[PDB]
Amino acid sequence: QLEEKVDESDVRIYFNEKSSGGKISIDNASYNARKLGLAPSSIDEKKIKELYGDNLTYEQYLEYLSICVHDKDNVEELIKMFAHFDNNCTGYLTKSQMKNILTTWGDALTDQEAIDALNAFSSEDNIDYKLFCEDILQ
Amino acid sequence: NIXSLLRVQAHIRKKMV
Numbered sequence: 001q002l003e004e005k006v007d008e009s010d011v012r013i014y015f016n017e018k019s020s021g022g023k024i025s026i027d028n029a030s031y032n033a034r035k036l037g038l039a040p041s042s043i044d045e046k047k048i049k050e051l052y053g054d055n056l057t058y059e060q061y062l063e064y065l066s067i068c069v070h071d072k073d074n075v076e077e078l079i080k081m082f083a084h085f086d087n088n089c090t091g092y093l094t095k096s097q098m099k100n101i102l103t104t105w106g107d108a109l110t111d112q113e114a115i116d117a118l119n120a121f122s123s124e125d126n127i128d129y130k131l132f133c134e135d136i137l138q
Numbered sequence: 139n140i141x142s143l144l145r146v147q148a149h150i151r152k153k154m155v
Contacts, residue, residue, distance in 0.1 A: 070145070109147055136153055
């Protein structure tokens with residue numbers, strides 16, 4: 001269910017790497033989730049905190065990981081904000097337009113974080129945001 | 139739009155790690 005998605009032994013290894021008193025902080029749990037190839041947002045983090053507080057047992061941590069699976073994510077879902085700014089419907093946005101979107105709203109990235117991500121995808125100024133989305137989903 | 143943006147930012151943070 002979650003094991004379909006991620007490596008079972010890495011789940012335990014990353015837990016042991018970060019646990020303290022047999023518990024793991026939400027920040028370390030989200031770090032681990034990312035290493036396992038999952039994508040938590042602040043919504044997932046607020047949700048697990050409301051259930052259990054800031055420090056998760058191993059079992060609560062596994063629950064948190066299932067919450068982070070997000071098997072509904074796909075390109076259609078991801079591009080919506082970008083497409084909305086693509087007034088002329090070209091399929092492209094400039095790096096500046098994309099950096100502004102990523103750093104201004106939502107779980108905003110720092111300027112550097114956005115720059116690194118956009119540069120990692122392409123050396124060109126005009127970005128195919130659908131392909132950019134396919135790439136981050138990997 | 140905003141919820142979709144969070145999923146974008148989430149996958150970007152995943153790639154950083």
